[PDB]
Amino acid sequence: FVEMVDNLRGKSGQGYYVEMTVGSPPQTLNILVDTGSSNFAVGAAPHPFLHRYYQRQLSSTYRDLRKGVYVPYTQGKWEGELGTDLVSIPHGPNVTVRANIAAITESDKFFINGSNWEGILGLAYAEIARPDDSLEPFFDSLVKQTHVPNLFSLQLCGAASVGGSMIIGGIDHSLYTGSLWYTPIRREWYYEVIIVRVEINGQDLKMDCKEYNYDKSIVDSGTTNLRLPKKVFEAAVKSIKAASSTEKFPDGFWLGEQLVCWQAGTTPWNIFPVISLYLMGEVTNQSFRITILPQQYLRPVDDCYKFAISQSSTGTVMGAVIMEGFYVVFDRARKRIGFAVSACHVHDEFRTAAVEGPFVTLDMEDCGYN
Incomplete structure (x- = not known):
């Protein structure tokens, strides 16, 4: 490997x-x-x-x-x-x-x-x-x-040139920290999974979990941004704006259009919330969660950044924004996808990305779209 x-x-x-x-x-x-x-x-x-x-x-x-x-x-x-x-x-x-x-x-x-x-x-x-x-x-x-073996794993490391690792047929322990948690592959077409809860800075976005997977959620290394459905997007932005309200940004920014810049080395990370996605677990009524730091959804382009979270109309897409923070294991043999903190993710000196569980979540099936 x-x-x-x-x-x-x-x-x-x-x-x-x-x-x-x-x-x-x-x-x-x-x-x-x-x-x-x-x-x-x-x-x-x-x-x-x-x-x-x-x-x-x-x-x-x-x-x-x-x-x-x-x-x-x-x-x-x-x-x-x-x-x-x-x-x-x-x-x-x-x-x-x-x-x-x-x-x-x-x-x-x-x-x-x-x-x-x-x-x-x-x-x-x-x-x-x-x-x-x-x-x-x-x-x-x-x-x-x-x-x-019927499985591969990806460690997308972002930065300009980017790099990463695609371990074919196995798992390389040196590419992640903490433990690996698994979510079931709902269906074998796209790499579809089910999000059962979303939180911003620890606060539930208070939405029917079905809105999180409308009309599906997938893990896609082919997409750059974390793409959330309209309802979910607006809710997420409204919440991130509030958290970072300490500063103002043009409507163009929250649309991935216009960027924002700060003196080299003075980006106010602390004012940007951490996002948590709860995924269905391997056990009945059990779930786990993955959390990305703002360094994940604020990708560089003096320091300038572009909002890497966009809206979708084809469901939730967990692209590089999400994947670059974790080591993703596509366990095809067992119809599941595992997540673990990536050994190459960028972190704050105060906050740290994570994959933790278990959590008790009832009627997770209901979150799936049909």
Whole structure:
């Protein structure tokens, strides 16, 4: 696992990517680690934003599936030709597997000009893969063709360049402190979990827990911000404004638009509240909680910061904002996701992030949306 430590790189806001090789001979490509999707797709044509791309014709092990794939978006998309080839992760488990690969030949609003990645590794379940759930995701193929345990863990460390670790097939004790707590994976499509309570500085936000998971909550390394549903968002902001009312900020700030700056080294951390998310536990009526410091939802860009908490309309998304404070274990074998304080999170000299429990929480099922 020490071979896999620090195997993730990236640029602030551009996601985390891991190095991979495809085809024979091996072609090196940087791939985005996305637990919010399920396709392994890489650029396979000279799009101007790409440092490089997958060249099928040069791989003796490449197999054309004579099938196309089209993945839409809010207003963009990527499309390509399906196939399979030998895939490997140089700084991962010492194995090689034949996996489905979507060679991207055309796309819009997908690649980022100036980024250093050329593809995406969707680690979620087949259920949301494209064109349909028959296209086996990379991880399923990794597990079914080798003896790598069916689980991976992520330690996203933020900072400009960012770094992290994706421990494949295991858990590395040196990446976290305290104990690991597990929440059940409600359903195997996205990495869906259930939030049963939210607190700001220790004070309940007083809301029906169902509003916290409307219309779902997921753990997504592919998203940058902690995204809360409207009702929840406004409630959270109203509460954070109050806590930091000692100072005023333009409406643009609370919208991730306009930023805020303070003399280098004089950021008033103490005036920003800590947020607590209570997740359903492994035992009936039992829950646990995770708390992020403001250094988590106030990401840098003299010191300037941008509100890293935005509203959503597609449910709660626990992106880098949340994940960067914890070591997240995607225990696929046991349908659960574990959290523990990350060994690389940024902390105050007074307040400290945490993962604690147990707590007694009744009718947690009711929090789930249907």
